[PDB]
Structures are given as structure tokens and as C-alpha cells.
Amino acid sequence: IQLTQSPSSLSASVGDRVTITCRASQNIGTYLNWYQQEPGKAPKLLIYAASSLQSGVPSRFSGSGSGTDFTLTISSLQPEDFATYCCQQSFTTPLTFGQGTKVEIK
Template sequence: MVEFGALPLFLCVMGLFSESLCFVTLEVEVGDNVTIWCRHELIVSGYIHWFKHTCGSAPLIIGCKQFFGSVPSQNCFFFNESERMVVSVQGENTSLTITAVNVSDTGLYYCSSTDLMRITFHETNYLRVKGSESRRQSESAGF
């Protein structure tokens, strides 16, 4: 069952919605640090996942935290967190912090919350990393 909240994201991922309706664009320079925020719906317990999606590939899970309500969240037992990409949970919000971004970090980022009954996808952000490498790529591609 797809919940209504997940439907727009699903349609965006499938390319059936205009890109301008699907996400907020964040622009950063190569070497910057960036934090992307997302609101989750977990109350008691569950999992919070962060995904990265780039054109022509399947979504890649890049972060996971196990949520226990008022108890501090823990890393998921089945997932090793990257040193550059760190997931945090503060109340009803979760964040993904990426340090020393590079051009390969460009992509669509979103979070999901999973409890015993459902998986819900939340806010979507497009991260565009600007820098000398991305300018050269854009120029050679004709943009």
C-alpha cells in the first residue's frame, strides 16, 4: 500500500512529475559541509533511513538510525555509517550532515520512517555541488 505522502515522491522518482514540483534545491561549493533536514512521523519506535538517488540508478541507502521515542537513537545493527555522512535524530526531525562535499555528492536526498505498519517517505532535497569540476562537466555537456 502506498500512502498519499509517499505518492508524490514515488511519482517524482518514476519521472512522472515535473522536477520543479518534487524537491527543494540546495547549492553548495566543493569542500563545504551541508546539513539536510527531514521531519519523520515516528512516535514510539522504528527506523529512519536516508537515501541518495541519482539519475539512471536505484536509490542508495546512505544512513540508518533505530528510533526509540525519548531514548537516544542508535545506529542500525545492519548498517555502517560513513565518516562523511552522519545521520542525527532530534525529536521529530532527522538530519543528514555531509562533510567536505564533492561533485559526486550531487543528487536527490530523502528520508523515510519505518514502523511495524508502514514505510513513509518524507521531504526531498536536491543537492547540487558547484565547483570547478561541475562547471567543466556542465560546459562539456552543453549546459
């Protein structure tokens, strides 16, 4: 099972309307997951089932999608969001990720 992301990388600024899409080779439904890793420490859960926003997290994050196409959306980008964001497959036990999308300043 092959998973893809778009864009591979981007450079943005504060408060931007950010949007990143993720495509699955086969219909997985909605169980896809969204993770982040900032430079230096442990990654944490952000979005699970592509429709649930993690507790203790700013509401500015948003997630949507179904079938094979899903998308994260950022209303107001913040200086702490310049990290590496990755997809996760929650389908049949062999599971992989996407290429990810590092968030850079512009």
C-alpha cells in the same frame, strides 16, 4: 503520517558543510532512514536507524536525530554527492517518504 524535509532543494559547492533536516508528524523514535539516488542508476542504502553509516561508504557522511527531528550532515561535500536524498519511515506498516532534497552545484 506526514513527513517533511528542509530544505526542499539547495545549490552548494565542493567541500561545503552541508546539513539537511527531516521532521516527522509523530514520534517515531530513531528508525528513520536516509537514502540517495544519483541521476541514472539504482539508489542504495546510506543511513539506517538514523545512527548507522553504511559499509563501503566515505566516513564524511554523518547522521543524527531522535524523536521527530533528524539531520544529515556533510563535512566535505564531493562532486559525487549532487544527488537526490530522501527520508524513510520505519514506523507502523503504512510507510511514506519525505519530499526529498536534490543537491545542486553552486
